[PDB]
């Protein structure tokens, strides 16, 4: 009808979703209220301006921001000088989602740059001459797979990579992030991701890893960084995704996990928070919402008959609304929340999350929801690797041609 | 000696005591990608760091240089590793180093390297005496700092410093009963000390949680904790729970109270309760109220729960197709 508002966040009843602090103010409620007030202004902006809302993904703007950043960054990025392969990955993946081609000049330059970052003893460091570390190793491999050329694939020294992973493996099943470094669930996911993509998984490489990851699931249903710690979206994505790669999702109580992640979507804002009682943040559009495609596949693999055949178990529309209305920088790039400055990390994850929210896929069944203008639709992303599903297939197929190091 | 922010700070290339060393520029290749346009100060320090690292110069000057490299990018794990190599080779006083890491963490508390460095120091010294108080100071600035809580759990567990933690948890819960990190710490302390099997402890916990729930019915943390500690043994195993929750319905409702009721029914139906029929309907009704009115952001989840319950608890669920 004429009075009907198609945008969920703008409907009159949506106002009922505002925080109820029970007249007991604490730091948590105060902070939450500030965010909601700020976001309510964004929602109400169309109304106060007397304009018809139009949700447009600023592609040209995002593209310019990305294409330039792929070549040069201001000193604002000095804090990421030990994470350059991540800059390559975040940017290339964002471009891939936006369906922007990667010029062969660019692709070859990225390849050569990543080679310089590759350690003589396996793995990639944060920049040339830096010691190898699992986080930039994961990023570098993903970046090379997005490129997907023979050159890209050939950059990876598979034998040394496997040697590197073994040098980090711990007796309790976990992995250090780097030599003399910390241990947390990120390492399990980073190792499993690169080892699976490059076909270097030996029989004992991940021995005890699934169990170690399962010990990270806590009373909340989610997964913490290490056993005993608070459940967090970043670590939960890492844990579940690694378990999916190792085909051991069953080790987890998938039911409490599903209840936990679904509870992480903010009723008012529409985006996701990283942990209970904290604030909404656009990057969790991926870390948190990305868990739904994973859970759907896990539960479906167990023959769960009650699974929807057209939607993920989260409010796809509300997440898209949050991202499109609150997470776009006018000059290009995406962000955490209104008031935050853009960065390539949030650009990569807000877009990744948007793609997840727009596309439902379950074998033969396929259903899209594209809020706003049709041009808003992005290329799909693989829920485990967060690179194009085609890149995943292409890479795995290619590496399966090689024998697992050792033979 | 010379702070990175000192008004009289001088670039390394202009320091006499460094004249013998040729700085090593970054090897970015002929046509760089993601090239960072570093400031003068940054590039100068790092060119000298690259030099000392490359020649593995384990010297006092190299040691002081790492402090600057760290202040420029505390996330540079390669610098932290070299610094730890220097601490051992140069036989540096580790308490002095503890003083240093305390200051660094105070200024950049959301960094993985600084907390890992402090941990290594504590391990080396086998001294946890300053930990709980240090962490408490950080938690006093950000009561939810993830690294702080994780380091705290490690110290407590490794050195068995359980004695006063529940008291600390009670203190923070009083300051902010919505602090999920504190509820998680509460569970950590209890499960590693008395455990929740002890009926007196469980009882105490549930009483406490229900009391917090009454004071702030919309605080999701108390709700998650209550479910967290009872769901293991099975919600149906506690008959009085349901009644008591229904009693809050009038003056303390929330999508949480309703969601919990569904969890209780769900388990009741799982442990073949009486009036299987009556229970299932009560549940599907709440699932609908949730997906349709009280908690629509989770409509896809609630619809799924409704279909799941129906799928295996309807009177027809056990009836053969031909009937």
């Amino acid at each position: 009808p004429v009075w009907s508002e198609p945008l969920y966040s703008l409907r009159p009843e949506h106002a009922r979703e505002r925080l109820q602090d029970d007249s007991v103010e604490t730091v948590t409620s105060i902070e939450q209220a500030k965010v909601e007030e700020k976001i309510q202004e964004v929602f109400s902006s169309y109304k106060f301006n007397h304009l018809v809302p139009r949700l447009v993904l600023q592609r040209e703007k995002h593209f310019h921001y990305l294409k330039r950043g792929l070549r040069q960054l201001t000193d604002a990025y000095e804090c990421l000088d030990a994470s350059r392969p991540w800059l390559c990955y975040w940017i290339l993946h964002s471009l891939e989602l936006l369906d922007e081609p990667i010029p062969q000049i660019v692709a070859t330059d990225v390849c050569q740059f990543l080679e310089l970052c590759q350690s003589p003893d396996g793995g990639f460091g944060g920049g040339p001459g830096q010691y190898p570390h699992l986080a930039p190793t994961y990023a570098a491999v993903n970046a090379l797979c997005i490129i997907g050329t023979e050159e890209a694939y050939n950059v990876i020294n598979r034998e040394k990579l496997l040697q590197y992973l073994y040098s980090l493996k711990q007796p309790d099943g976990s992995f250090l992030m780097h030599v003399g470094g910390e241990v947390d669930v990120r390492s399990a996911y980073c190792a499993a991701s690169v080892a699976s993509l490059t076909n270097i998984i030996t029989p004992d490489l991940f021995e005890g890893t699934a169990e170690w990851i399962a010990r990270c699931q806590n009373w909340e249903g989610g997964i913490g960084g290490v056993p005993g710690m608070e459940a967090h979206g970043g670590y939960t994505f890492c844990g579940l995704a690694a378990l999916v790669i190792l085909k051991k999702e069953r080790s987890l109580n998938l039911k409490s996990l599903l209840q936990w992640v679904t509870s992480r979507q903010m009723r008012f804002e529409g985006g996701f928070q990283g942990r209970c009682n904290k604030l909404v943040d656009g990057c969790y559009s991926f870390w948190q919402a990305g868990l739904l495609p994973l859970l759907h596949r896990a539960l479906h693999a167990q023959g769960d008959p009650a699974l929807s055949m057209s939607h993920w178990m989260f409010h796809q529309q509300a997440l898209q609304e949050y991202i499109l209305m609150c997470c776009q920088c006018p000059a290009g790039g995406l962000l955490d929340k209104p008031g935050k400055s853009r960065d390539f990390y949030h650009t990569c994850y807000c877009l990744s999350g948007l793609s997840i929210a727009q596309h439902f896929g379950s074998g033969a069944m396929l259903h899209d929801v594209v809020m706003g203008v049709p041009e808003n639709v992005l290329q799909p992303t693989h829920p485990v690797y967060n690179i194009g599903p085609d890149k995943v297939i292409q890479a795995t197929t290619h590496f399966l041609q090689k024998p697992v190091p050792g033979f | 000696f010379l702070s990175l922010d000192s008004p009289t700070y001088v670039l390394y290339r202009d320091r006499a005591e460094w004249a013998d060393i040729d700085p090593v520029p970054q090897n970015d290749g002929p046509s760089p990608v993601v090239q960072i346009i570093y400031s003068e100060k940054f590039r100068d320090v790092y060119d000298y760091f690259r030099a000392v690292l490359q020649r593995d110069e384990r010297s006092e000057r190299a040691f002081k240089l790492t402090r600057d490299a760290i202040e420029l990018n505390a996330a540079n794990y390669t610098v932290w590793h070299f610094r730890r190599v220097l601490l051992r080779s140069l036989q540096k006083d580790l308490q002095e180093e503890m003083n240093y890491i305390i200051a660094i963490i105070e200024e950049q508390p959301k960094n993985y390297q600084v907390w890992h460095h402090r941990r290594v120091l504590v391990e080396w010294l086998k001294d946890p005496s300053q930990e709980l108080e240090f962490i408490a100071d950080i938690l006093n600035q950000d009561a939810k700092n993830y690294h702080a809580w994780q380091h705290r759990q490690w110290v407590i567990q490794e050195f068995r410093l359980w004695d006063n933690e529940l008291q600390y948890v009670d203190q923070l819960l009083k300051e902010d009963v919505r602090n999920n990190s504190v509820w998680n710490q509460r569970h950590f302390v209890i499960s590693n000390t008395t455990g929740y099997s002890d009926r007196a402890v469980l009882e105490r916990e549930v009483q406490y949680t229900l009391e917090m729930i009454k004071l702030v019915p919309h605080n999701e943390s108390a709700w998650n904790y209550l479910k967290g500690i009872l769901q293991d043994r099975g919600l149906s195993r506690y008959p009085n729970l349901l009644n008591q929750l229904l009693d809050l319905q009038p003056s303390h409702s929330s999508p949480y109270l309703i969601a919990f009721l569904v969890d209780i029914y769900e388990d009741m139906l799982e442990n073949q309760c009486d009036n299987k029929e009556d229970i299932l309907n009560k549940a599907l009704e709440l699932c609908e109220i949730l997906a349709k009115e009280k908690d629509t952001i989770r409509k896809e989840y609630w619809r799924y729960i409704g279909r799941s319950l129906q799928s295996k608890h309807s009177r027809e669920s056990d009836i053969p197709a031909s009937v």
Binding site: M177, R186, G274, D281, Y284 | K110, N111, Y112
Partner: peptide, 4 residues
Amino acid sequence: CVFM
């Protein structure tokens, strides 16, 4: 948030 943080990541590494």
